[PDB]
């Protein structure tokens, strides 16, 4: 089965094509991860996935989505990830991390605590920053402060320092969070970027923050470890053909700038959209980005059955299949997929203390 | 659903009727558990089971099954369990432990490393002890040393010391391992016990080691925490009616000795048997023990589907359903069962960072 073929990118070899995409846990305190994350990540890595990308980890305190978000804005924050890196590697998986800045969608409650912007009377909140002083709307009404040129320099340096820390902590795969309506995506989109300086207006200017951040990270991230990004390539806002064409052109520039793989997603920049949710619906879009930009890709949002994942690889729509929620339901989902796809010795997707007995359960 | 009704025994309340029975991991070193066990147990506890009984933990070095078995024969060994106890509790499950002595089945290889008695030239092996100098046979040919009265006194004290260490580590539930052909079971069975002293021959004599060990443990284990045992009530050796009658009588004497619940199993004392493996095959046997000995029971060996578990509880065959291998396959099996049985808010079997999203997946 294609899902269980290894994948090599730079010096990193994944044992199969199953990637666990970044999934915020909202369980950190002051950015510091803890026993929640340690067990959560170690268990999923033992489940068999070849790559585990750690959740959106803020490059700066105001770049957290919520008060429960992980951070990597100090060396002490980075050192807290070391046992997670070690547990993922000990399980035979590859440890990655998504480094992030939530932009105008920051200072929000946890999803099971309202999911909305923290009110001004709640001392847990903080001022948000963005390309322009314009709110997302809906449940995120807080108007962000428009970034200064010094803010732009500072946030870029925060991404550099976050990448340096991720490198030194032993991560073997990095993903820049340029998707999902957060800071990077909001620089690209004309919905959110009304700037009149070098960072807004034209395609070159809207791309500039993302390309400059990529280039700055490229200087500190090892050439032999995959340098990746997540990017929303369309919004389902009635502008899809033009937006996809521009996003694919930006992907070409990412490739020229040393990007090794693109996690293809939806922008989620504004709420006034009509996303056609369905099984594997991103398949054709990821395939178009992969083929037209000539870059390996992953995607998510409905590939979480063994046959859907296998079909996407066979059709050369994806290079890795990201499977998120199914791994929250079952940390050993990779083993479940190996069984369903008839992999020889499927139980040995898991470590010996499980595999021995489940082979004989069979 | 009966499977998701709470259960109270002494001062302990389990949130549902799903118990994870003891399952050796073979990953300890010199009896000390480590990060294998920490993640393994914490992840299963977060999966939703109401009770998690930690694997057979040796009361003495020679009572391990294998060089990978956990031990609790010193205070340092007990302290290693504290983070496991606390992680199970933090997940909302109840931490138990099975304390054990492998008897003539000790000094064996891990199951995926031959599963057989360690060879005499292998430096990892040790001298085994048993009621009588008689080998199990088959893949376990080593002849054990017949225990003296001094050995009997010492092993009993080892069980006492282990129970006191388990108490201080914070376990809320203890299970004495009198099953599966190990030391306790082998004192009961005429196949393995040929003694001519007070500990062999008659039913009273064969029961004596088990009753005296239970009574000695009772003096140090808190009256307000469940005191349980696992015991093989038949062998499938052509002597089932007589053996089950004797085993049920011993269960009555365990109850008179303060036992709160019996984990009903098969003896596995000798290899020359014909065990009729099948779904829920222990149901009728556990029901007979429960009704005739008037004692709460659990059992295992084929209850690991949601409907089989539910049916056994509704028929009053069991008070708790032990589900072992299904939790190695999926450490969130309790959530899978809640979904299959149509429990309201089934996703909230899991902690919020999973439950919130799986409710909406639905
Ligand atoms: C709990 C949760 C947290 C998420 N956090 C992140 C995140 O930190 N970064 C990110 O890029 N996507 C995040 N996402 C989106 C997922 O990576 C993924 O795209 C989504 O779950 C769809 O894939 P699936 O259908 O396999 O679940 C998150 C999704 C969930 C359910
Ligand atoms: C890996 C493994 C380890 C086990 N270790 C123990 C043990 O330490 N003590 C015990 O009493 N039973 C042990 N058993 C037997 C189980 O507790 C249980 O009775 C068996 O797995 C049957 O239940 P199931 O059909 O739900 O798996 C073990 C079983 C397995 C698969
Ligand atoms: C068998 C492979 O798994 C392991 O050894 C492990 N984590 O995966 C540890 C720390 O014991
Ligand atoms: C809905 C698009 O945004 C995401 O997927 C996300 N992070 O990227 C979270 C934490 O929800
Ligand atoms: C029929 C069950 O066989 C097993 O796997 C087992 N436990 O589950 C053993 C041998 O310990
Ligand atoms: C909200 C549930 O969180 C937990 O269960 C936990 N351990 O289990 C923590 C706080 O780390
Ligand atoms: C075959 C019966 O033995 C067991 O289940 C056991 N412990 O009790 C193991 C395999 O470790
Ligand atoms: C509640 C819907 O869950 C999702 O689709 C999701 N990821 O899978 C989000 C919003 O991040």
């Amino acid at each position: 089965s294609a899902l269980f073929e290894p994948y090599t990118l730079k010096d990193v070899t994944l044992r199969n094509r199953i990637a666990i995409p970044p999934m915020c846990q909202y369980m950190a305190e002051d950015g510091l991860i803890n026993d929640w994350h340690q067990v959560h990540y170690a268990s999923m890595a033992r489940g068999g996935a070849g790559l585990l990308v750690v959740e959106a980890t803020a490059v700066a305190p105001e770049g957290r989505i919520t008060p429960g978000c992980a951070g990597i804005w100090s060396d002490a924050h980075a050192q807290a990830f070391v046992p997670v890196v070690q547990a993922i590697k000990a399980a035979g998986s590859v440890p990655g991390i998504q480094i992030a800045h939530a932009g105008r969608k920051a200072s929000a409650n946890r999803p099971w605590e309202g999911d909305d912007h923290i009110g001004a009377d709640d001392a847990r909140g903080w001022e948000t920053i963005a390309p322009s002083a314009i709110a997302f709307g809906a449940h995120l009404p807080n108007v962000p402060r428009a970034m200064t040129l010094d803010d732009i320099a500072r946030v870029k340096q925060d991404f550099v320092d976050a990448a340096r820390r991720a490198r030194d902590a032993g991560f073997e795969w990095i993903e820049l969070h340029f998707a999902h309506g957060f800071l990077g995506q909001s620089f690209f989109s004309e919905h959110s970027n009304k700037r009149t300086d070098a960072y807004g207006g034209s395609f070159d200017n809207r791309s500039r923050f993302l390309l400059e951040t990529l280039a700055a990270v490229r200087e500190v991230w090892p050439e032999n470890l995959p340098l990746t990004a997540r990017f929303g390539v369309l919004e389902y806002d009635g502008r899809d053909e033009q937006t996809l064409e521009e996003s694919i052109e930006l992907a070409r520039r990412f490739k020229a700038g040393g990007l090794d793989l693109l996690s293809v997603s939806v922008g989620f920049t504004i709420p006034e959209t009509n996303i056609p949710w369905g099984p594997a619906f991103m398949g054709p879009i990821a395939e178009r980005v992969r083929r037209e930009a000539k870059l390996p890709v992953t995607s998510a949002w409905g590939f979480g059955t063994p046959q859907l994942a296998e079909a996407a690889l066979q059709a050369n729509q994806l290079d890795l299949v990201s499977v998120g929620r199914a791994h929250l339901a079952d940390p050993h989902w990779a083993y479940f997929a190996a069984k369903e796809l008839g992999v020889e010795k499927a139980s040995w997707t898991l470590p010996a203390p499980y595999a021995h007995w489940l082979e004989r359960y069979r």
Side-chain angles (χ1 to χ4, degrees), chain A:
Chain A
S1 91
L3 190 58
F4 287 90
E5 292 174 7
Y7 181 65
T8 297
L9 190 57
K10 295 290 189 58
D11 283 3
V12 166
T13 294
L14 308 183
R15 63 187 165 196
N16 57 47
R17 305 306 182 97
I18 299 169
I20 303 179
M23 288 179 291
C24 281
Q25 298 298 288
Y26 312 92
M27 292 292 284
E29 190 175 25
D30 304 319
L32 289 172
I33 63 162
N34 55 52
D35 286 350
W36 174 261
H37 313 82
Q38 184 65 40
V39 169
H40 164 73
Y41 288 116
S43 185
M44 292 193 301
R46 296 173 184 190
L51 172 65
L52 208 177
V53 185
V54 167
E55 65 197 273
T57 295
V59 305
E62 83 288 343
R64 287 176 295 168
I65 306 169
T66 78
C69 287
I72 196 164
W73 64 75
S74 79
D75 291 358
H77 284 85
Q79 298 163 16
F81 286 98
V82 171
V84 168
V85 170
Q86 286 166 344
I88 294 172
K89 290 183 182 184
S93 190
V94 168
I97 186 167
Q98 185 189 60
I99 59 168
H101 192 298
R104 69 186 183 175
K105 303 182 50 184
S107 193
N109 280 295
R110 297 180 181 85
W112 54 92
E113 296 171 347
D115 201 47
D116 57 340
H117 261 151
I118 295 170
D121 52 310
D122 186 332
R124 297 173 310 130
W126 59 86
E127 176 161 79
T128 57
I129 61 172
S132 303
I134 176 171
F136 180 88
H139 61 298
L140 299 172
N142 291 0
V143 181
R145 174 171 76 71
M147 288 173 70
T148 67
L149 291 182
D150 281 5
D151 288 329
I152 289 172
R154 190 269 297 171
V155 170
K156 286 192 298 176
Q157 188 60 48
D158 285 348
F159 273 90
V160 173
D161 293 343
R164 279 207 283 179
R165 290 177 184 123
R167 176 198 73 203
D168 289 346
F171 285 99
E172 296 175 348
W173 182 289
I174 196 165
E175 185 185 291
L176 305 183
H177 197 350
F178 293 163
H180 301 170
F182 300 123
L183 189 64
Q185 185 85 58
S186 69
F187 268 98
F188 183 73
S189 176
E190 300 184 88
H191 288 297
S192 45
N193 186 340
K194 318 297 191 181
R195 298 182 73 89
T196 58
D197 65 3
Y199 291 90
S202 66
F203 169 80
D204 283 348
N205 285 7
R206 287 180 289 105
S207 298
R208 191 175 311 284
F209 174 82
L210 295 79
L211 290 169
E212 285 181 356
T213 297
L214 173 62
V217 168
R218 189 189 187 184
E219 291 186 355
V220 305
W221 185 254
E223 177 67 30
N224 68 312
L225 301 177
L227 172 55
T228 80
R230 199 167 207 182
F231 181 46
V233 302
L234 80 171
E235 302 281 346
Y236 295 103
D237 61 351
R239 316 169 69 221
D240 294 332
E241 182 58 29
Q242 182 195 36
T243 304
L244 245 191
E245 189 173 9
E246 285 196 2
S247 299
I248 288 172
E249 189 62 26
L250 182 53
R252 291 191 180 96
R253 279 142 216 240
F254 285 160
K255 179 184 176 68
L259 201 79
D260 295 311
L261 180 144
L262 189 64
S263 183
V264 174
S265 196
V266 175
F268 305 100
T269 301
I270 55 161
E272 301 89 1
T273 62
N274 289 280
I275 300 168
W277 302 107
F281 83 99
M282 291 291 299
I285 282 166
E287 190 281 331
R288 177 173 163 185
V289 175
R290 183 183 192 265
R291 175 170 40 78
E292 289 184 4
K294 298 281 187 283
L295 208 43
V297 302
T298 190
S299 194
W301 312 102
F303 297 98
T305 76
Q307 300 296 347
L308 288 171
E310 179 74 9
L313 292 167
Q314 297 260 354
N316 288 313
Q317 296 172 323
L318 301 184
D319 298 85
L320 298 174
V321 187
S322 292
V323 177
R325 284 166 294 173
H327 275 105
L328 308 182
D330 176 2
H332 296 178
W333 185 87
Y335 157 71
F336 170 84
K339 275 188 311 184
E340 176 159 342
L341 298 173
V343 169
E344 312 278 342
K345 297 307 156 188
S347 74
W348 288 90
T349 304
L350 298 172
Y354 305 155
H356 174 81
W357 303 99
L358 298 170
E359 183 172 30
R360 289 141 183 80
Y361 216 15
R362 194 34 50 109

